[PDB]
């Protein structure tokens, strides 16, 4: 039973809690009982939902891609034909989880992926096909798939998950960061070079996923859309940051677009208005 | 008795006095410390060149000229030419350092104006082009001169709009980072003590900036009538608990 | 074989359910957690940090003057500023309090409002910061402002007043979204005496307004925010 407000009466004193100096960079914990006469109230509240494992720990959509089950005879590279699709795993392509994560500089969490696959036949199908998706977790250095059915999909050491379309996949991935936390922000470079990329680092590299329909093909085409949902768990967060105000433009960069809209709402009246 | 305004910081053979200070900020209430054995991964015995590098290095003074937008310095980049600390930064593969950052701006009781002196860990700068354009190495590594935020955009450089903190956030929300104000009414001095803040125990000091120091005028400089419409701002930075590991040849950076 | 019955909601993906799932990486040993300063366990920790309010959002562009509340010399009894206290809207929408408040639907507890005087040290001002609890309008003359919760602020060697907004909502939480039933009331500053400037100094001096949360502050019913948006997925 935490006290929210103490009972305070009239004070006429030299102890003045409500005068301070913001120059010191501190926020004085000034209570309501410091400047008005209060009564005793209780919190009845523990702050469990603003906990960072509750805050970062529900499933956000992080990626939507499409793969096609299709006749592959006479197709050059099979990735432009969407016969398979690889996704470099990041939590910054879709901005709703990105803004929550980038409230912190460093974050460490075990991941928990939920992959939903949904099909559609936009033209001339007699039936909806019972399809199976392979989601192969591809770490950096693994051979990337170049065909939808090459040797890489054997996955003797890569983690794969088979699941039906319409059904969903679910697997947790541990914290796979090389450092003690992921870098949401990286003020630097991979090396001392005049042309190397800024901010794009392997310190938030989480692996990659490769997706294909494992079925061969039917007479009609099937468009399978994959929706990876990420839930962070065992979340640890460091260095709270200023929240994002402007729209993002790219993965891994703090860039904002040119000639953007003002984010502070202009008041209708003057500074005196309500 | 003793004032909270009269402070002395002695580091090495360097001393800073102030008689118009605020209370010094220790970032996240953590004093700089050497790397303990339980956190270390690098197996080299680190060199701790204590009084020769952990000492105050005064940077070039900035003139705050009533239309100034602000100034950003990068650490350890602002101290890459500063004595033995600058040399150990290039001869070693690795290094970790905390900082005492001290910012000076004196004025008369007739002056007004307020500086935001803020320390931002991993201040990843935005490009002025948007999209996926990166900032070149020489622009996030300016050294002693820092980044003048009132200067124009240069191709390959960061965006210099002070309202968006050069990173797409807002200026008012920088106070979540460890900061002080130099309000000329109250203090002429901002003192911020920074620990080593990184996801790694020790890191490359030349390709990575751990923290940035931004000195931002919030309330503009109003000088009294007939006075010089300019105040010098001096930034004095001392490394603290500085380790260096992996000694090799002197690394050549872009300049 | 155990006879089981399958319930409703079987095979559903509730995105907020917190279950155990198989690991794709058995026997993986993650990187040792080193000590990093500034660990956050709870967002109620960091909304007790005061951040600047853009009270002067009277421009057509985001600028530093939006954070600057102007004071003027020869002014008795007038209003310095006024605002409503919808903390997920208005001047508060972009502050750190208001950004984290917009991830939640309900808020309770007391606000912490700071003003920082930034004029010259030989200037003097007395201001009166009024909180009007809801039911009445936004005050119009300083006479109806001081009938509510107010602090008279003499400006001297300490440049910062800290006015709390005490909690007025028997409906135990309010909405973070602007809702008329759960309006928090009005905030206004008035010239108590006036701003007196020293000789050889002219013009305006500025106030800096800060907002934070008291430790009795509550947030619940986590929701998506209206701040960030997206048309297409971002690329590398």
């Amino acid at each position: 039973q935490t006290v929210a407000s103490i009972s305070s009466g009239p004070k006429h004193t030299q102890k003045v809690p409500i005068l301070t100096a913001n120059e010191t960079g501190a926020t004085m914990p000034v209570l309501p009982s410091d400047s008005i006469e209060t009564r005793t109230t209780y919190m009845h509240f523990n702050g469990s939902e603003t906990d960072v494992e509750c805050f970062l720990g529900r499933a956000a959509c992080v990626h939507v891609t499409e793969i096609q089950n299709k006749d592959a005879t006479g197709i050059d590279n099979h990735r432009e034909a969407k016969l398979f699709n690889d996704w470099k795993i990041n939590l910054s392509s879709l901005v709703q989880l990105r803004k929550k994560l980038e409230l912190f500089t460093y974050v460490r969490f075990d991941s928990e992926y939920t992959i939903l696959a949904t099909a559609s036949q936009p033209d001339s199908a007699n039936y909806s096909s019972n399809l199976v998706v392979q989601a192969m977790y591809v770490p950096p250095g693994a051979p990337n798939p170049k065909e939808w059915d090459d040797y890489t999909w054997q996955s003797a050491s890569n983690p794969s998950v088979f699941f039906k379309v319409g059904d969903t996949s679910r697997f947790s991935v541990p914290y796979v960061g090389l450092a003690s936390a992921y870098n949401c922000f990286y003020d630097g470079y991979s090396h001392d070079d005049a042309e190397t990329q800024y901010g794009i680092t392997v310190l938030n590299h989480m692996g990659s996923m490769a997706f294909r329909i494992v079925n061969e093909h039917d007479e009609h085409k099937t468009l399978v859309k994959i929706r990876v949902y990420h839930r962070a768990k065992h979340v640890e967060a460091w260095i709270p940051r200023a929240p994002r105000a402007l729209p993002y433009t790219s993965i891994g960069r703090t860039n904002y677009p040119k000639n953007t809209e003002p984010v502070i709402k202009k008041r209708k009246g003057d500074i005196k208005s309500y | 008795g003793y004032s909270d305004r009269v402070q002395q910081i002695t580091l090495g053979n360097s001393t800073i006095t102030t008689q118009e200070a605020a209370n010094a900020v220790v970032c996240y209430a953590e004093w700089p410390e050497y790397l303990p054995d339980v956190d270390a991964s690098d197996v080299n015995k680190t060199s701790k060149p204590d009084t020769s590098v952990c000492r105050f290095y005064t940077l070039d003074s900035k003139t705050w000229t009533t239309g100034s937008k602000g100034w950003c310095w990068k650490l350890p980049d602002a101290l890459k030419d500063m004595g033995v600390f600058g040399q150990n930064m290039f001869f070693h593969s690795l290094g970790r350092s905390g900082y005492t950052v001290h910012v000076q701006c004196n004025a008369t009781k007739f002056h007004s104006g307020c500086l935001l002196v803020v320390v931002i860990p991993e201040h990843q700068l935005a490009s002025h082009e948007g999209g996926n354009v990166s900032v070149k190495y020489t622009f996030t590594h300016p050294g002693e001169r820092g980044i003048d935020l009132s200067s124009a955009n240069e191709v390959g450089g960061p965006v210099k709009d002070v309202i968006y903190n050069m990173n797409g956030t807002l200026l008012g929300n920088l106070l979540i980072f460890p900061h002080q104000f130099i309000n000329l009414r109250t203090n002429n001095t901002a003192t911020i003590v920074i620990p080593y803040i990184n996801s790694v125990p020790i890191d490359s000091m030349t390709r990575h900036n751990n923290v940035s120091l931004m000195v931002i005028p919030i309330a503009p400089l109003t000088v009294p009538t007939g006075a010089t419409p300019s105040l010098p701002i001096t930034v004095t930075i001392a490394p603290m608990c500085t380790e260096f590991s992996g000694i090799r040849s002197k690394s050549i950076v872009p300049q | 074989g155990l006879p089981t019955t399958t319930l409703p909601g079987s095979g559903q993906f509730l995105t907020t359910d917190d279950r155990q799932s198989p690991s794709a990486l058995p026997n993986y040993e993650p990187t040792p957690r080193i000590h990093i300063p500034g660990k956050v366990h709870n967002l109620l920790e960091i909304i007790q940090v005061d951040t600047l309010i853009p009270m002067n959002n009277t421009h057509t562009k985001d600028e530093v003057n939006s954070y600057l509340i102007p004071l003027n010399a020869n002014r008795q009894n007038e209003q310095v500023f006024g605002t409503n206290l919808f903390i997920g809207d208005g001047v508060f929408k972009t502050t750190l309090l208001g950004e984290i408040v917009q991830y939640y639907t309900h808020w309770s507890g007391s606000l912490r409002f700071s003003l920082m005087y930034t004029g010259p040290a030989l200037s003097s001002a007395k201001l009166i910061l009024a909180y009007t609890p809801p039911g009445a309008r936004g005050p119009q003359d300083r006479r109806e402002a001081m009938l509510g919760t107010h602090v008279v602020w003499d400006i001297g060697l300490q440049s910062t007043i800290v006015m709390t907004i005490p909690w007025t909502s028997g409906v135990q939480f309010r909405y973070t979204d602007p809702d008329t039933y759960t309006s928090a009331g009005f905030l206004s500053c008035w010239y108590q005496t006036s701003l007196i400037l020293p000789p050889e100094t002219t013009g305006q001096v500025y106030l800096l307004s800060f907002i934070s949360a008291c430790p009795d502050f509550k947030l619940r019913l986590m929701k998506d925010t209206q701040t960030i948006s997206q048309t297409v997925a971002l690329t590398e």
């Epitope: 003057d270 | 109003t222 009538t225 419409p229 | 562009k61 102007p70 119009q140 010239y191 002219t202 013009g203």
Partner: antibody
Framework: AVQLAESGPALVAPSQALSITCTVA????????VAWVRQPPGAGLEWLGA???????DYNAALKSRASIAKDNSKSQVFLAMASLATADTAAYYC??????????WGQGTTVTVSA | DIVLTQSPAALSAAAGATVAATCRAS??????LAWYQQKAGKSPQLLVY???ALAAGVPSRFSGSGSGTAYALAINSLAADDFGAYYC?????????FGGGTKLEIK
Amino acid sequence: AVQLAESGPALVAPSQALSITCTVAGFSLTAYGVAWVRQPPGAGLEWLGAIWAAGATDYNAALKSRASIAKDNSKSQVFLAMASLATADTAAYYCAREWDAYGDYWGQGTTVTVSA
Amino acid sequence: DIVLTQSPAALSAAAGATVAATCRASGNIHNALAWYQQKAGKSPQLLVYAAAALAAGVPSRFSGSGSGTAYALAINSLAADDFGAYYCQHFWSTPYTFGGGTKLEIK
């Protein structure tokens, strides 16, 4: 509808007093101040003075001895009184509601001719 | 006091040109400057407040710029409605003195 309607005698003998009024509609004088600006024909605008939202007044530095601005908050009338007129006071006089302390909502203006 | 020196006295131009009127102040206004449009025999109309921000119902041809003591009012592609006399006024405490005035004429 924020309106500031000037009204004056418009024909004043020199070395006399002005009694130029602005009846205020659309706002209250307790909340917004009123600026006064004249413009002689051919020449440019001259700021005469401002009464602020609670009766504090500021004036043109060359006309502090002549001009005096007062108001009635209940009658919504702001008064401009210029004593000891000269022939260079022939001007169309304007009122303005204050708007971020800037003057706008300028009235139609009444021309005053100071002649004998 | 603060003297506003507005320059030049007159600028004759045709419809569709780029015209900049300039006010130089004796002291720093800190962007507390207003630009006014006055047509022939009409009340002054506020175009730009805070030296850069367009007022209510002002077309986007007008653009205020400048800071400190120097301030510019630029018009892109003059229309026929944009002719008349233009005035600065600063608002830095008091007195709120005007500039001299720029009259826009037709070639």
